Structure 1
Amino acid sequence: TSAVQQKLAALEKSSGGRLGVALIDTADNTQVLYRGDERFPMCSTSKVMAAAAVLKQSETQKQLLNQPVEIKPADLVNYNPIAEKHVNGTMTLAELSAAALQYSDNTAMNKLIAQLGGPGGVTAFARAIGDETFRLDRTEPTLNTAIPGDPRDTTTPRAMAQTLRQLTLGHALGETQRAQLVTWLKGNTTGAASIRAGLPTSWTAGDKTGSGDYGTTNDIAVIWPQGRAPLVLVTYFTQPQQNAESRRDVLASAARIIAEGL
């Protein structure tokens, strides 16, 4: 029990929900965990693994990211800010990857999942890079039901922090692919209220947010603090009632606690 864990515990108690945190500091490879081995519903944070899996495929198919995918009216789901522009046309796997990562487009995610052979294709890729915890079971939008105690479409903070580190700072992907993933994450449009809200403004970062039922509010980030080695930080949050409201502020507070303890 560190000072940091006690602060996170205090935040959790006043939040009404359940908080999970995992930090890896690549300066010394030390970790700070809070409910690090408990499962949480990933919601849109799973888009990172799907995008990464497609990047892996592109290592042996040089033109893969230029491959077109048909977007049909029936394909549109519940949040399609990019796909809606291209219905009855096509989008490339690059376009879909960027839409999924940077705008959290749910139709684009479904296309990535299809390209991987279904949710289990995403899980297969996680296993291939050494993540024995991640599981993707469903497509969008039902992967966001986030029912307490449900193991579907979940991971642990420890596992996601490790995987994010290997994808963005390690060798799970080819160099070109790693760089592309980082570029996409740093270009995210959805993250300014979440982990990054709790960080010193001078720092740089990329992230992927997620939200769902049970007021589930998630963020996973790769962070470059001024003057030191990168960090990986995962903050997952979820609440007892199905119609609970989002709490990005809790994620920001978690990140602030983590930042002050560095």
Structure 2
Amino acid sequence: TSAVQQKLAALEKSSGGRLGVALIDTADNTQVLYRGDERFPMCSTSKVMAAAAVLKQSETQKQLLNQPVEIKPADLVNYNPIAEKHVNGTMTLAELSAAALQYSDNTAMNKLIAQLGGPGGVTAFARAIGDETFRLDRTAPTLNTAIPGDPRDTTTPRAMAQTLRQLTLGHALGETQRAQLVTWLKGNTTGAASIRAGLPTSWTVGDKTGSGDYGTTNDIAVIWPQGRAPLVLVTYFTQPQQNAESRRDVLASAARIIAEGL
């Protein structure tokens, strides 16, 4: 147990929930884990895998990201700020990817999942790029039920960190596609209260958040620190009671502890 792990344990104790953290520092490829091999519900952080899978498809179909997808009134779910503008019209797969990632539009995520042949298609992509832990089982919104003990729509912090690194900094995608994914993440709108809130302002972040029942509050980020090689940081958090409140501050606090321990 390291100093950083002891600080994260103290944070967890004061929070009353269960915290999972994985850092990869690409300066030396070293890792810092806290409950790194426990399963957590991904919620909307799973949207990175779906978007990446469609990017991979687009490597052998030049026009794919321009392909129109019909949005019907029945397609709208619980949170769909972009898709609801396009009901009885269309969005392109690029537009759906940006909406899913940057606004966490759930209807957009469901169109990505459909483009991949269902939740199993997203899992198949994960396996193809060497992630044996990720599983997507359901569409939105029910992929966010986040029930304790439920293996559906979960991964581990270690696994997600390794996959996010491969996607954004490694060679799981083609160069253009990797750049596009990083551009999308850097343009996230939802992130400022989470991992980013715990880091120095000068550090550049691209991230995807998630939320669900059981006060589940997630964020996965690729970080470019001032004067340092990039990091990849996963922070997962979930609480015992179904109607617990979000705790984005706990993610910020975890990020701060990680930053101060570099």
TM tier relative to shorter chain:
over 0.9
In structure 2, what is the Cα distance between the partners aligned to 1:205 and 1:248? 16
Alpha-carbon distance, 1:86 to partner: 0.4
Quote the offset at 1:171 in angstroms. Answer: 0.1
Matches of 1:169 and 1:157, distance apart in 2: 17
Paired with 1:200 and 1:152, the residues of 2 have a C-alpha distance of 35
User: How much has 1:83 moved relative to structure 2?
Assistant: 0.2
Distance, in Å, in 2 between the alignment partners of 1:87 and 1:17 is 39
* SS of structure 1 residue aligned to 2:14: helix
Q: Deviations over 1:206-230 (max 9, x none)?
A: 0000000000000000000010100
Distance apart, 1:14 and its partner CA:
0.5
Query: Where do residues 1-262 of structure 1 align in structure 2 (5 Å cutoff)?
Result: 1-262=1-262
Q: What does the per-residue CA deviation read over 1:2-42, in whole Å, with 9 as the maximum and x for residues that have no partner?
A: 00000000000000100000000000000000000000000
Shift of 1:116: 0.2
TM (norm. structure 1) is 1.00
**What secondary structure sits across from 1:91 in the alignment?**
strand
Q: Deviation of residue 254 (structure 1)?
A: 0.1
1:229 is paired with a residue whose SS is: coil
Aligned residue pair count: 262
Matched residue of 1:251: which SS? helix
CA positional deviation for 1:90? 0.1
Q: CA deviation at 1:259?
A: 0.2
Aligned-partner SS, 1:99: helix
Inter-partner Cα distance in structure 1 for 2:58 and 2:76: 25
TM-aligned CA deviation for residue 80 of structure 1? 0.2
What is the deviation of 1:131?
Answer: 0.1
Segments of 5+ residues of structure 2 without an aligned counterpart are: none
How far did residue 238 of structure 1 move?
Answer: 0.1
Instruction: Report the Cα distance in structure 2 between the residues aligned to 1:16 and 1:93, rounded to whole angstroms.
Output: 40
Note the alpha carbon deviations across 1:110-159, whole angstroms, 9 max, x for none: 00000000000000000000000000000000000000000000000000
Identity %: 99
Give the aligned CA root-mean-square deviation in angstroms: 0.2
**Structure 1: gaps spanning 5 or more residues:** none
Distance 2:109 2:4 in 1: 35
Deviation at 1:75, TM superposition (A): 0.4
- Residues 72-129 of structure 1 show CA distances to partners (whole Å, capped at 9, x for unaligned) of 0000000000001000000000000000000000000000000000000000000000
Deviation at 1:249, TM superposition (A): 0.2
